[PDB]
Design an enzyme around this catalytic site. Sequence first.
Site, mmCIF file in Angstrom:
data_model
loop_
_atom_site.group_PDB
_atom_site.id
_atom_site.type_symbol
_atom_site.label_atom_id
_atom_site.label_comp_id
_atom_site.label_asym_id
_atom_site.label_seq_id
_atom_site.Cartn_x
_atom_site.Cartn_y
_atom_site.Cartn_z
ATOM 1 N N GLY A 22 37.675 49.214 17.520
ATOM 2 C CA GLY A 22 38.584 48.848 18.617
ATOM 3 C C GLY A 22 39.023 49.953 19.574
ATOM 4 N N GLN A 25 45.123 51.176 24.742
ATOM 5 C CA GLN A 25 45.784 52.129 25.580
ATOM 6 C C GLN A 25 45.887 53.503 24.883
ATOM 7 O OE1 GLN A 25 49.688 52.353 27.808
ATOM 8 N NE2 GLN A 25 49.609 50.258 27.006
ATOM 9 N N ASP A 134 56.986 46.177 11.552
ATOM 10 C CA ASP A 134 55.878 45.477 12.235
ATOM 11 C C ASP A 134 55.033 44.558 11.322
ATOM 12 O OD1 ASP A 134 54.274 44.762 14.341
ATOM 13 O OD2 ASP A 134 53.682 46.784 14.798
HETATM 14 C C1 LIG Z 1 42.705 54.827 10.579
HETATM 15 C C2 LIG Z 1 44.174 54.509 10.482
HETATM 16 C C3 LIG Z 1 45.170 55.315 11.086
HETATM 17 C C4 LIG Z 1 46.530 55.069 10.879
HETATM 18 C C5 LIG Z 1 46.940 53.902 10.228
HETATM 19 C C6 LIG Z 1 46.031 53.048 9.609
HETATM 20 C C7 LIG Z 1 46.527 51.770 8.931
HETATM 21 C C8 LIG Z 1 44.583 53.315 9.721
HETATM 22 N N1 LIG Z 1 43.623 52.487 9.192
HETATM 23 C C9 LIG Z 1 42.917 51.512 9.883
HETATM 24 N N2 LIG Z 1 43.333 51.058 11.075
HETATM 25 C C10 LIG Z 1 42.659 50.112 11.735
HETATM 26 C C11 LIG Z 1 41.562 49.477 11.154
HETATM 27 C C12 LIG Z 1 40.913 48.355 11.901
HETATM 28 C C13 LIG Z 1 41.081 48.248 13.274
HETATM 29 C C14 LIG Z 1 40.474 47.210 13.988
HETATM 30 C C15 LIG Z 1 39.764 46.253 13.317
HETATM 31 C C16 LIG Z 1 39.671 46.296 11.918
HETATM 32 C C17 LIG Z 1 40.198 47.387 11.230
HETATM 33 N N3 LIG Z 1 41.126 49.853 9.922
HETATM 34 C C18 LIG Z 1 40.094 49.417 9.165
HETATM 35 N N4 LIG Z 1 40.055 50.093 7.997
HETATM 36 C C19 LIG Z 1 41.053 51.001 8.014
HETATM 37 C C20 LIG Z 1 41.723 50.857 9.283
#
Ligand SMILES: Cc1cccc(C)c1Nc1ncc(-c2ccccc2)n2cncc12
Length: 271
Positions: A22, A25, A134
């Site tokens: 993904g 912004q 959230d």
């Molecule tokens: C990478 C990260 C940074 C800070 C906080 C968190 C919760 C995450 N982890 C993730 N954040 C986002 C996604 C994700 C984003 C878009 C679609 C599906 C998964 N994700 C998928 N596997 C792990 C993650």
Amino acid sequence: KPWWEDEWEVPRETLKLVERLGAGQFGEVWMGYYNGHTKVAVKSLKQGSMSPDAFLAEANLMKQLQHQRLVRLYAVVTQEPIYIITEYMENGSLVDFLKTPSGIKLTINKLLDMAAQIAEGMAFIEERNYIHRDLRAANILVSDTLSCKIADFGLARLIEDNEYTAREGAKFPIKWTAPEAINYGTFTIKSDVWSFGILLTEIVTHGRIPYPGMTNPEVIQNLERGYRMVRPDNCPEELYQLMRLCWKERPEDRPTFDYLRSVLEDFFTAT
Ligand SMILES: Cc1cccc(C)c1Nc1ncc(-c2ccccc2)n2cncc12
């Protein structure tokens, strides 16, 4: 604690961004690999879009909140483009996963299961003295083994005493947030309970947007009359009475997270 000492800092080399999950912004999220073999997710900050110190406050809060039910901080890169690396969740967000072939086949039993994993994860957050702020199906993440972990900690906060009060000009998703948080900007683990209530409605209706025919002002006007959400189609009456303690008028009347877990485990194994 400085970066040439941070057990969390990694050389950028160690990483290999493969598939963008993904973009918005504030930057991008990528699945990739750490030292070749270990699947990870990497969040990268779009320079200039927001403060690097505010980007990393997420990472720093997650350093403190570690539990199986919580998505785990792996590492940070704290220069050029700033990365937050975590444990990878194969099945993406709860709210999307529930809409897929696999998600659509889930029994009610499996769903009540997942709901108890989320409550568990929050019973940890509860007891460590954090709030999430959230909590919704979009911020629950699903693994290859159909387990669930709390995600996105953008707004998550440690509290000295019970109240965290937002800055007067703050907006949060009305359908998911508790009246006192929308009105006075006051959040407590009891606000999160209310949202969890709403998330229950997302699990049990698969995808759907809560309060089916209603705009925000219609949803506010209804709460104030003493109504709550219409029993979602196909919602076991039990789980509905549960969402209902989640939506008590006064927060201190709202239940604990440990108790929700407790109850959701019975519902789950009773089926
Ligand atoms: C990478 C990260 C940074 C800070 C906080 C968190 C919760 C995450 N982890 C993730 N954040 C986002 C996604 C994700 C984003 C878009 C679609 C599906 C998964 N994700 C998928 N596997 C792990 C993650």
